[PDB]
Amino acid sequence: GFRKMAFPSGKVEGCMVQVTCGTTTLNGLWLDDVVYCPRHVICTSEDMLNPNYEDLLIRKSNHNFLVQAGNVQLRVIGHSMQNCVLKLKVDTANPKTPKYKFVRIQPGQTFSVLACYNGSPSGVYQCAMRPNFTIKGSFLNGSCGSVGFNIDYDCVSFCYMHHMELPTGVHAGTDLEGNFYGPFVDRQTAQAAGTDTTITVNVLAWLYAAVINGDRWFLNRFTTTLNDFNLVAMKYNYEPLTQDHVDILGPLSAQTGIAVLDMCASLKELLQNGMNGRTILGSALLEDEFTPFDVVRQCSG
Amino acid sequence: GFRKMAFPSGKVEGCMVQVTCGTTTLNGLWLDDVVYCPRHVICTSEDMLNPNYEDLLIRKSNHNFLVQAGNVQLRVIGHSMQNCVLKLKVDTANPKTPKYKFVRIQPGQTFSVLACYNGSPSGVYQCAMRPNFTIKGSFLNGSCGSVGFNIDYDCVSFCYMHHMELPTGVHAGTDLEGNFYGPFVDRQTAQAAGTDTTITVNVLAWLYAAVINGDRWFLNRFTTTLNDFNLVAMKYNYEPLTQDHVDILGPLSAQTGIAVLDMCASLKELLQNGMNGRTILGSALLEDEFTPFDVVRQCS
Numbered sequence: 001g002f003r004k005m006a007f008p009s010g011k012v013e014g015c016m017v018q019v020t021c022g023t024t025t026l027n028g029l030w031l032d033d034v035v036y037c038p039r040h041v042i043c044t045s046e047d048m049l050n051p052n053y054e055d056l057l058i059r060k061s062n063h064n065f066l067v068q069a070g071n072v073q074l075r076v077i078g079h080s081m082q083n084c085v086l087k088l089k090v091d092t093a094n095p096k097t098p099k100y101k102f103v104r105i106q107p108g109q110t111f112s113v114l115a116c117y118n119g120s121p122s123g124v125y126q127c128a129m130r131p132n133f134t135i136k137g138s139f140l141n142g143s144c145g146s147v148g149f150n151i152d153y154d155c156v157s158f159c160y161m162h163h164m165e166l167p168t169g170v171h172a173g174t175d176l177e178g179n180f181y182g183p184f185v186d187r188q189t190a191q192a193a194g195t196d197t198t199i200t201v202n203v204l205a206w207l208y209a210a211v212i213n214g215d216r217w218f219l220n221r222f223t224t225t226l227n228d229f230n231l232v233a234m235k236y237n238y239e240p241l242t243q244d245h246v247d248i249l250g251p252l253s254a255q256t257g258i259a260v261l262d263m264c265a266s267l268k269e270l271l272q273n274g275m276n277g278r279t280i281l282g283s284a285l286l287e288d289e290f291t292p293f294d295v296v297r298q299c300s301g
Numbered sequence: 302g303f304r305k306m307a308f309p310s311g312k313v314e315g316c317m318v319q320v321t322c323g324t325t326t327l328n329g330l331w332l333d334d335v336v337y338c339p340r341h342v343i344c345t346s347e348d349m350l351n352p353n354y355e356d357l358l359i360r361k362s363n364h365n366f367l368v369q370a371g372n373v374q375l376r377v378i379g380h381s382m383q384n385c386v387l388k389l390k391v392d393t394a395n396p397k398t399p400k401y402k403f404v405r406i407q408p409g410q411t412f413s414v415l416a417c418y419n420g421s422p423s424g425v426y427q428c429a430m431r432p433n434f435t436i437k438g439s440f441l442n443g444s445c446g447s448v449g450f451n452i453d454y455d456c457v458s459f460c461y462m463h464h465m466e467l468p469t470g471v472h473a474g475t476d477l478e479g480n481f482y483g484p485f486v487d488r489q490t491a492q493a494a495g496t497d498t499t500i501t502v503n504v505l506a507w508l509y510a511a512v513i514n515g516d517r518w519f520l521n522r523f524t525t526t527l528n529d530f531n532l533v534a535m536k537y538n539y540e541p542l543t544q545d546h547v548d549i550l551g552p553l554s555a556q557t558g559i560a561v562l563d564m565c566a567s568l569k570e571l572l573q574n575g576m577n578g579r580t581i582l583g584s585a586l587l588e589d590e591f592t593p594f595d596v597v598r599q600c601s
């Protein structure tokens with residue numbers, strides 16, 4: 001009884017618009033009198049090979065941007081490039097603008113993606129920022145400008161805008177100031193994300209979710225120290241566990257009466273021994289896209 | 302590159318309200334001037350062992366029902382029971398009422414769940430109605446009255462409202478007329494869902510999703526017959542495959558140039574041989590909560 005869960009998307013649906021420029025169309029994020037979208041909307045197909053964005057944007061004028069909010073065209077009255085995102089000022093402020101902010105997330109953190117096409121939402125799902133600054137998403141052509149987000153209190157925290165796919169099938173994009181996550185560039189060339197690693201603190205969170213849900217075959221008598229556990233995790237390309245990670249997991253430990261280091265001994269066993277064909281929360285693998293926060297939010301409402 | 306994906310939840314968020322009767326509080330669904338919620342909101346803790354709902358409801362009047370859409374208190378002017386759901390007529394039509402219908406989904410079909418607590422949405426995810434009429438959700442106390450739904454065009458089809466958990470951890474509830482999916486009753490007694498079965502057509506659809514996403518290690522040079530494949534499906538508690546299933550899968554067979562019966566052969570072998578430790582779309586198991594429809598809509 002523990003699912004991958006996304007935040008309600010309603011506050012965000014009313015921010016999505018359609019942005020066209022030439023024959024390239026993608027999604028924009030309409031907040032106040034500004035629409036944010038990926039700058040590569042100004043590229044033809046030839047340009048994407050090795051674009052000079054400054055030069056390409058000079059040749060553009062306000063009226064080359066067809067922005068549609070539903071059955072309504074909005075008039076573009078300005079434009080700037082901020083790193084890899086375009087900001088088209090518009091003559092209408094979005095009445096559906098929520099309380100919001102822009103954040104740059106840390107690797108290991110999760111967020112919800114509102115996948116859109118032609119400015120219309122099709123679906124929402126939960127993602128993690130991988131340690132190598134990619135996300136394993138579900139993105140097709142036209143999905144660029146779709147945004148990732150958290151909701152905390154009344155406040156929408158925008159943290160991602162989608163730009164590209166990499167040869168491994170994973171995805172890359174920017175924060176809402178246009179700075180990529182990771183070493184990527186918005187040009188059409190094969191690019192390497194580097195070795196991904198497993199988010200150890202999230203796997204321990206998911207094991208606590210498993211215990212909280214009456215699924216505890218993997219517990220043992222033993223224990224370990226942070227040092228000895230990291231000796232093992234390195235071998236399997238797990239992020240090393242800090243003490244801050246132990247204190248993050250404190251509340252989950254409190255709810256289960258299982259000390260973090262005791263749980264680490266259980267994970268050490270699972271990595272060295274494998275699942276043996278058993279399952280954990282209906283999964284035949286170890287799951288690393290739940291933060292401790294996500295587990296608390298779900299397991300206590 | 303293929304994820305479980307829920308519909309956008311905005312049209313439904315604006316329908317969720319808080320229903321209180323006594324000390325019991327759960328969620329209701331506000332459409333036009335009617336709030337729908339589970340009838341066990343009128344139960345105390347004692348009553349839940351074996352309630353006489355007709356008798357329990359007599360003792361209630363309109364003013365025993367507190368309804369709040371956010372901070373807005375709605376005044377209840379009428380109450381009726383329809384099967385296992387209460388309808389509270391209220392003095393205000395919901396300005397955010399979407400285009401909606403009520404439908405009763407078939408097993409093997411999927412829908413999105415807007416999990417709510419105290420009339421406020423906390424999250425959304427995708428579910429399937431299992432063959433044994435249960436769903437594998439994430440519901441805690443206070444989650445009753447949360448609804449499951451599909452969106453086609455601008456039209457919200459409401460198909461589920463949540464009522465209870467079974468001892469196995471799976472979940473049971475009603476359509477929006479209050480008729481349970483499955484043999485269940487809204488009383489706090491042990492209740493059996495019976496042997497679950499695997500939604501064969503959905504597994505085939507997911508294997509097609511896999512091939513569309515560059516993952517074909519499981520394909521083979523063998524083939525098989527409908528009748529031959531089903532002999533093996535019985536063994537493993539799989540719904541049998543009809544030719545309707547074959548035709549529903551027609552669009553996916555096209556897109557990949559793999560014939561359904563060839564895929565049935567690859568599936569037969571996975572059932573017989575196992576996954577040999579490998580994976581398909583990042584799962585070490587066979588997934589059966591994607592309809593052919595879901596796979597199409599995602600991959601195109």
Ligand SMILES: *[C@@H](O)[C@H](C[C@@H]1CCNC1=O)NC(=O)[C@H](CC(C)C)NC(=O)OCC(C)(C)Oc1cccc(F)c1
Nearest residue numbers: 341440443444445464465466467487488489490491492
């Ligand atoms: C909605 O508010 C809750 C949700 C329930 C609580 C835990 N997880 C859930 O999904 N529903 C209930 O409290 C019902 C109300 C009755 C009038 C049906 N009770 C309930 O779900 O009890 C669950 C347990 C304790 C397992 O008992 C039952 C109840 C019904 C059938 C069973 F097989 C077992």
